[PDB]
RNA sequence: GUUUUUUUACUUAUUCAAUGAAGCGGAGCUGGAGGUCAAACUCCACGUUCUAGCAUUAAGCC
RNA sequence: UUGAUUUUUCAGGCCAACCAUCGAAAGGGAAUCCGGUUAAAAUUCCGGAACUUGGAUAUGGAUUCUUCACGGCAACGUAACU
């Protein structure tokens, strides 16, 4: 016991080296990083105009699960899927009967951008999901606008890879219902009315919003205290 | 007409300084966290001369704060600066000769070297021997410093902005006369090569703006303007006035 | 579908949606290098029109060059 | 959410898995013979008169060899043709561009004897 | 209501500088003050200065 | 770099400030001398006597039960002496 001593060390300025701290606030990043949070900066720091600004505004995580809980229940056929029911219309062809009779009329949820698009300028759409993270942005930037003139419930959904692993795919732009079974429709109701409340009704207010403007944590530590000052 | 002498100057051929025997440039140490908010304490290894420097310079060490390691600093020399001195540099450091302090710490009246013109840049003012810079006065609210500068110029510097305590050593060398072509080429052999100076009006017209006639003689104004282009400015560049200087100034 | 929407958009260069947009990939672009390979088109529909298809073997480079 | 602890500030390149190659083809289809063996290696016996001097007195055999070769390539060549160890290689290239050695054997041999056998004297 | 001039605020464009991108910004502990009169309201500091030594690979506590 | 594991795979740990490369037959730089010998070579051959670097590895010695040697006031000494 009297050989086990406590030797605190000092750490003050000329004394002991200083010990390995956590630095990960001064690292030199590789510059593809320092990119990727600049640009991410730089949209927060200008106005943003309203048009782009929508998306701004997703889907919270109860409804969005909820979308996603409905939208799980009409994915598209999968390679070995479509593979069998493939060869069971061969069958009904190498018999008699044809393939129509055999295999029902699908309803699948609907994507890609030109797809989706052309369906809702035909009101064929009952509910668009967008994705708020798509890059050239032009690609959905006018789609609110499209279907609130086509009177086509939308929300702005989060994820592009969510929206691509419904239909299969990498990512997905857009995902539509064009309709549901019957056993589906009350919670599509439910479903639509609570997104109207956000997207479709506030859009004609929401083309007055501008985003963006945000300063940065330092610049508004000094605005802080000059409304402390006066104060 | 052919290139003359100045215009030349700027390729940097046989122009270039003589820098083999130089012992390294002279700098402060780089701001960090210690002299930012307190003081780094040195310890003065040796005074050694510099070729081609009029003032001595001083190797100091210090201890790195970050590391187990040796640092090594050259610093140019003030007078009464010897080896084995200890020095302090930081914001908390004290008024000594020798000591490295910021600006806004000295109070009026300080004498000080080595000064830096803008925060952290490691010393611009005030190098040559003999020479120093004056503290005038403090504007705090400012957060600036007035000074004084050899030439006899005022500036406003950062109050932040470091200097070192005390005159540059090795002054009072020009209160000696050369007497001799040897003694100066013995001067610039490690300086750079600017010595001799043939003189423009000895030349012939394509040498020079003043070459060339049955006298010696420049012709016109030896007075060029400011906005005259290279090839012209040969003489007294936009002069204010010529002449002997009488009266004060 | 969106192509034409795309064209329609891209002639309004002086809208503030178009101008915000410029400024931003003028920024990002001016950080890399002044030649980089891009990993698709920013203009989809313009590339399309230009004979561009979504292959394998097709490939988009973006330059910069002093005016 | 849970980020790294860094106690350096220099990002440096990380290790990545370095596959060695599987080609599907072997790129050269034959291998190339032995470009140097023992015959290229040792051209022909020299056998001027100071040549064999060498021979009778300091147990030395004078041989033209490639230009290419080096000393341990001779000696093992030697060897291999006529079983013998050299003491030593003293190689020379002449001035008409061509190499000679002077390998003198060991004491175990007899370099008139090996001569003679050779077929040169 | 849109427009010219002047002035001055901002920071992300752009520009200059430093570094092996090491301690930035704000808050809070700890103290010392300002006589308090409501309880912490303002301020300031927050481990190194006789000496040409030594400080590196954490002790200790839960 | 080790601990080794053979499994030619691992397990860690230590750091990466600096370091492409070229640039001297007078600068820097591991180590050879004497005698003899040829028509013509020699610090290169022959005879004798050494040295340096890189490696392997055995014996002898030295060290350790006060574990990593002793002596001298000291300057310092020694065949060794983590
Ligand atoms: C004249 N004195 C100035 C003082 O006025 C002030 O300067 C600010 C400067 O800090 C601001 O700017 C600074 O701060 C902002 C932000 C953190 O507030 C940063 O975004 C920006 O990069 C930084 N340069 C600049 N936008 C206005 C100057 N008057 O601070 C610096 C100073 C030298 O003391
Ligand atoms: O402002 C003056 C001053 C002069 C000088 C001197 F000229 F010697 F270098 N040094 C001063 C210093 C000094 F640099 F630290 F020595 C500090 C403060 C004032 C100084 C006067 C001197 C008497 C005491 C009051 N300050």
């Known amino acids: 016991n009297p050989l086990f001593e406590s030797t605190p060390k000092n750490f003050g300025i000329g004394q002991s080296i200083q010990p390995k701290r956590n630095l990960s606030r001064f690292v030199k990043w590789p510059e593809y990083v320092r990119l990727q949070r600049q640009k991410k900066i730089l949209s927060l720091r200008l106005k943003v105009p309203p048009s782009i600004a929508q998306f701004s505004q997703t889907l919270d995580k109860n409804t ?116 549901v079974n019957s056993a589906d429709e009350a919670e599509l109701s439910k479903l639509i009315s609570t997104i109207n409340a956000n997207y479709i009704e506030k859009y004609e207010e929401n083309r007055k919003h501008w985003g963006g403007g945000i300063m940065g944590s330092k610049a508004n530590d000094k605005i802080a205290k000059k409304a402390k000052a006066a104060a | 007409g052919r290139v003359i002498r100045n215009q030349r100057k700027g390729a940097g051929s046989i122009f270039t300084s003589h820098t083999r025997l130089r012992k390294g440039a002279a700098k402060l140490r780089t701001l960090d966290y210690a002299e930012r908010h307190g003081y780094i304490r040195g310890v003065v290894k040796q ?203 | 579908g969106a192509y034409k929407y795309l064209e329609e958009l891209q002639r309004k260069k002086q809208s503030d949606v178009m101008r915000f947009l410029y400024r931003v990939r003028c920024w990002e672009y001016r950080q890399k290098n002044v030649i980089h390979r891009a990993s698709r088109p920013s203009r989809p529909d313009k590339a399309r029109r230009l004979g561009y298809k979504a292959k394998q073997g097709f490939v988009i480079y973006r330059i910069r060059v002093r005016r | 959410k849970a980020l790294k602890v860094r106690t350096s500030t220099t990002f440096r390149l990380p290790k990545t898995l370095k596959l060695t190659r599987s080609p599907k083809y072997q790129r050269k289809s034959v291998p190339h013979y032995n470009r140097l063996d023992a015959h290229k290696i040792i051209v022909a016996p020299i056998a001027t008169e100071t040549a064999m001097k060498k021979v009778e007195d300091g147990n030395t055999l004078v041989f033209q060899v490639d230009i290419k070769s080096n000393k341990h390539q001779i000696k093992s060549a030697v060897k291999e043709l006529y079983d013998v160890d050299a003491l030593y290689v003293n190689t020379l290239i002449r001035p008409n561009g061509t190499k000679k050695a002077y390998i003198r054997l060991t004491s175990d041999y007899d370099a008139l004897d090996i001569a003679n056998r050779i077929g040169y004297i």
């Open chain 1, 64 to 179: 969005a699960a909820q979308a996603f809980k409905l939208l799980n229940k009409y994915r598209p056929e999968t390679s070995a899927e479509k593979k069998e029911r493939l060869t069971k219309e061969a069958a009904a062809i190498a018999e008699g009967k044809t393939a129509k009779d055999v295999s029902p009329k699908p309803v699948v949820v609907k994507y890609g951008l030109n797809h989706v698009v052309s369906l809702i300028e035909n009101k064929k759409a009952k509910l668009v999901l967008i994705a708020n993270d798509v890059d050239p942005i032009e690609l959905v930037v006018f789609l609110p606008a499209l279907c609130k003139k086509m009177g086509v419930p939308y929300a702005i959904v989060k994820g592009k890879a969510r929206l691509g692993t419904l239909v299969h795919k990498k990512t997905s732009a857009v995902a539509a219902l064009t309709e």
């Open chain 2, 47 to 249: 005074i050694i001369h510099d070729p081609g420097r009029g003032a001595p310079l001083a190797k100091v060490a210090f201890r790195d704060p970050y590391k187990y390691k040796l640092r090594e600093e050259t610093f140019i020399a003030n007078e009464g600066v010897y080896t084995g001195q200890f020095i302090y540099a930081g914001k908390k450091a004290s008024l000594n000769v020798g000591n490295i302090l910021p600006l806004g710490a000295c109070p009026e009246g300080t004498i000080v070297s080595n000064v830096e013109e803008k925060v952290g840049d490691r010393g611009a003012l005030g190098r040559t021997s003999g020479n120093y810079v004056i503290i005038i006065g403090h504007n705090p609210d400012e957060n600036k410093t007035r000074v004084k500068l050899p030439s006899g110029a005022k500036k406003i510097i950062s109050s932040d902005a470091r200097g070192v305590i005390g005159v540059v050593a090795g002054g009072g060398r020009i209160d000696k006369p050369l007497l001799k072509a040897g003694r100066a080429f013995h001067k610039y052999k490690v300086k750079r090569n600017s010595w001799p100076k043939t003189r423009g009006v000895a030349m012939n017209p394509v040498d020079h703006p003043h070459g060339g006639g049955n006298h010696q003689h420049i012709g016109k104004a030896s007075t060029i303007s400011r906005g005259a282009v290279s090839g012209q400015k040969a003489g007294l560049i936009a002069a204010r006035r010529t002449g002997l200087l009488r009266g004060t100034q």
